[PDB]
Amino acid sequence: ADVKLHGFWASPFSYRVIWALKLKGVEFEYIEEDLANKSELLLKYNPVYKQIPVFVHGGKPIAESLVILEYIEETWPENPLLPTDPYERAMARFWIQYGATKSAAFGALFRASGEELEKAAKEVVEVLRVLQEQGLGDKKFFGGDSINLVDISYGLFVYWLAAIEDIVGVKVLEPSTLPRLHAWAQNFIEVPLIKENHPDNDKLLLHMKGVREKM
Template sequence: MLLYEHPLSSYAQKVKIALREKGLAFTAELPVDFGTGRRDGPFAEANPRAEVPVLVDGAVTLFESTVILEYIEERWPEPPLLPSDPAARARARLTEDICDTQYEAVNWGYGEVLWFRRASGALAERLKARAARQTGELQAWLAERLGEAPWFGGSDFGWADAAAAPVVNRSIHYGLGPAAGSPLARWHARLRKRASVAETFAEFDAAAERMAAASEHYTTGGRRREYRDHRLEWMVRSGGVEVVLAGLRDGNIRFSWPHGD
């Protein structure tokens, strides 16, 4: 199998964790035209949105991380990532949805300031403070769902853990992690010892070290960061409208397909 991915993508990370939990062999590839908005080539043909991850399994090509996760679970049901109880399965999917939308947007917004320096001075501080407060709120929500159990599904690592792992780990990378010794912090410590997660996090760490040097590509127009749905909402309602307008003016942000031009 081929997985188009980027090691920093929370969506790609959860898919890699799932594949590794299932013991499935795959080749991870960073598309050469990732972030350029190109509309031709194998990557664009596989996903008109030009987003990662994309899974190519023989004649099957899939994009959208949740759809990919569902495909993996149904095609290779052992070991299961979803619990058997319908209510528990729904809770796992709900945790994933919050991590994929609200939580990912907060991390993304913080990264726009920290890594890509799209704001400075008072605006940068305001955006970072907003992200820090919301991170605490989201981690409290996750902590309540986790309780004192070792994993979000109870005694077994599963779907919700794979989804929450990348977003919580990125917060910790930003210095916005849960309180030391808290249940969520202990959960993260357990995560890091799990082979599927340790390998995925190591790839994240290596890519994060290179991000400062690569960030210029995303502010000079060589690469364009994607502003879509929950990300755009976060930036606008957090007071960063001028960041969006500057990106449109300078041509270093993009929106998703369909293009309409």
């Protein structure tokens, strides 16, 4: 059954799926979607959200990156991206859900006014501290010695932190404040799979700087 991925060049959600497929060694056709003029296939495949990514396997579509990632893990179980033990799997799902819930704080910091900025940055630092202390601990990656679906889901945090630093100017992931999480972020971007698969940084900063003009 052939695999298609409808994505967007600057989307971290589309990149989550690219990472999981490339890790599994699953060949796929990538389809770049124009978000200003959504394709007939995108609207047919994702009527509920009308968003990318849309993963298609054997002509059958799946929307929502977290749902797609679990389908990929179940369909191509070799090179596992989740643990086999139910309790460890529940801890992985717990941290993936925590990230999804707290993702709103990153967008809030990105659009915060000159005054709102201090409180927004404070809330992001506390989210990162809990993630570091209770989620990562002393492990190299959320997945232990190699990346797993938890690391993949936290690519979105790295994407936001780098955009807030380069465009806004506030630093929320500092080595002296969060040494373990900062070491994790550096180690994650150095994983060859990640290094080989990410938006062009200059093009991404420019696009995101322009998107921030919503104020």
